């Protein structure tokens, strides 16, 4: 019998879980900090071997994030491997203004996912003793009427090439483990050293005690 949350953290997260179940397009995520390569290998191997095939989703994609002055983000995800290659080749010498103009011109499809991340609605709680962050953010999917944000020329761009493995451990939870190549420069991206991201993403609201037990299970895999 071991606890993750203190009394104040428990009560604040309970309110976050309530807000999550009540608001449209809200996501609830528990991000694990300082995941390195051997952790990545252990986690991926652990879940691939025991998770049923239809509950395993594997995706290679490029996330282009346009960060506006208000700190909000317009993010385009390209899933088609050839379009990723064409984008990298055609825009390697282009300016941020030229790239941003092309990014907002793209229309959503099965290979192109678009989302507007309202970081102002963001609620973030760090659990210092367990190196995790509990976050709830609004992510509005722009699918195929779309009213896109205006390009002024003061946008910052961040590129993230991701190799993601997603495991649906039950009806309300999903483990996302990702090998990420991050860079604000296009031609550098595919060769920059990988950072590793691990998250427990909710599909539906759960009791905080169920959240505690699920997080403890992930910590048990990570720990040496």
Query: Token pair of 106, please?
Result: 């793209």
Q: This structure's resolution (angstroms)?
A: 2.0
CB-based contact 100:151 (threshold 8 Å) = yes
Closest CA to 175 of 202, 196, 141, 194: 202
Question: Three-state SS for 127?
Answer: strand
Query: Token pair of 176, please?
Result: 């996302």
Domain extent for 159: 1-224
Strands (E), 36-172: 56-67, 73-78, 112-127, 132-141, 156-170
- Per the structure, how many domains does the chain have? 1
Taking the C-alpha atoms of residue 167 and residue 47, their distance in angstroms, rounded to an integer, is 7
Taking the C-alpha atoms of residue 86 and residue 100, their distance in angstroms, rounded to an integer, is 16
Q: How was this structure determined?
A: X-ray
Residue with tokens 């599909």: 203
Q: Check which CATH number belongs to the domain holding 94 and give it.
A: 3.20.100.10
Phi and psi (nearest 5°) for 134?
-100, 120
């Amino acid at each position: 019998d071991i606890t993750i949350f203190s009394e104040n953290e428990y009560n604040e997260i309970v309110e976050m879980l309530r807000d999550y179940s009540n608001g449209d397009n809200l996501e609830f995520e528990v991000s694990f900090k300082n995941i390195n390569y051997p952790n990545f290998m252990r986690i991926t191997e652990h879940y691939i071997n025991i998770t049923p095939e239809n509950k395993i989703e594997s995706n290679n994609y490029l996330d282009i994030s346009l960060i506006f002055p208000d700190k909000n983000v317009y993010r385009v995800s390209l899933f088609n491997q050839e379009q990723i290659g064409e984008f990298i080749t055609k825009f390697s010498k282009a300016s941020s203004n030229d790239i941003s103009r092309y990014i907002v011109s793209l229309d959503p499809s099965d290979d192109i996912e678009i989302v507007y991340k309202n970081r102002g609605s963001g609620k973030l709680i760090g659990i210092d003793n367990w190196a995790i962050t509990i976050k709830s953010t609004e992510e509005i999917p722009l699918v195929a009427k779309i009213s896109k944000p205006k390009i002024t020329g003061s946008e910052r761009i961040m590129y993230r090439y991701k190799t993601r493995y997603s495991f649906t451990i039950n009806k309300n939870s999903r483990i996302d483990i990702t090998d990420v190549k991050s860079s604000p420069i296009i031609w550098k991206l595919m060769t920059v050293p990988s950072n590793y991201e691990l998250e427990l993403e909710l599909i539906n609201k759960i009791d905080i005690n169920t959240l505690e037990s699920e997080l403890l299970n992930v910590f048990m895999i990570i720990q040496d």
